[PDB]
Amino acid sequence: MIVTPASIKALMTSWRKDFQGGLEDAPSQYNKIAMVVNSSTRSNTYGWLGK
Amino acid sequence: MIVTPASIKALMTSWRKDFQGGLEDAPSQYNKIAMVVNSSTRSNTYGWLGK
């Protein structure tokens, strides 16, 4: 039994980094209700014709 | 006749860049009355000798 200081013994560990991003957010559901459109200016003007 | 709204009718214009430089500045005529000397440091000193 090689008597070892606690500080040195603590360094004998393995980094696993498996819990990263574990707690995500609620799933996105806006794609069922909205349509994505782009823009290239201060605003976006929509126009359509009547029947 | 298609009764378009006011904003749609206002967007139906063409952009022209004939007014770009605005009004040009006055002519530069300070070389006729001033002598131009180049400085190289914090200030210039001039000295002459009396008659």
Q: Resolution of the experimental model in angstroms, please?
A: 3.2
A21 CB within 8 Å of a chain B CB: no
- Nearest-CA distance A38 → chain B (Å): 19
How many angstroms away from the CA of A46 is the closest CA of chain B?
A: 9
Mark B3-32 as b/e (b = at least 16 C-beta within 10 Å): eeeeeeeeeeeeeeeeeeeeeeeeeeeeee
Residues of A in contact with B7 (CB under 8 A): 45
| C-alpha distances out from residue A39 to A30, A42, A49, Å | 19, 8, 21
Distance (Å, rounded) from C-alpha B9 to C-alpha B2?
11
